[PDB]
């Protein structure tokens, strides 16, 4: 199972998102009437889900330091690329 | 200067809110015009303000498990006595 189709089955059911109307293109934040309540349930879901830890700070710090931009966390075919190196750092510790 | 005062100051400068509509009865989230990514522009500047950093999933985690209600962390006010209590705790480390 993709990664992507994983993030999108657990936002759906995170947030009860009829699971057809999420996509690649679609974001965590600002769409698909998440909220930031519902934004942060969504990161935690995640979490567990893949035994990581989305690093909030660290991101928001490089949107800001001008290293990054929000689509590359926030749009949901990025955050799964993001997990995917959250993941390959994690196993390797493990 | 009170921990809420401190509070109001970095919302205003981090998201160019004015000051003098940010009271102790406010909201992080959902009010003052703050969207998803001013919260985390929030939170951000909030831990290198205090030198703290607030456990966002571990908050999340509480709600959820109906140790905690959102008021409690998202209510100006409340979220000083967060922030306070953070604070002790890290103190004491140092």
Chains 1, 2 share one sequence.
Do not use: M
Request: charged share 30%; hydrophobic share 45%; glycine share 4%.
């Amino acid at each position: 199972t993709s990664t992507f189709d994983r993030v999108a089955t657990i936002i759906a059911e995170t947030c009860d998102i009829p699971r057809e109307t999420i996509t690649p293109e679609s974001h965590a934040i600002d769409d698909l009437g998440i909220d930031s309540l519902d934004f942060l349930d969504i990161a935690f879901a995640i979490d567990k889900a893949f035994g990581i830890k989305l690093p909030l700070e660290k991101w928001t710090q490089e949107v800001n330091d001008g290293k990054a931009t929000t689509e590359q966390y926030f749009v949901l075919k990025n955050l799964a690329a993001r997990i995917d190196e959250l993941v390959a750092a994690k196993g390797a510790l493990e």
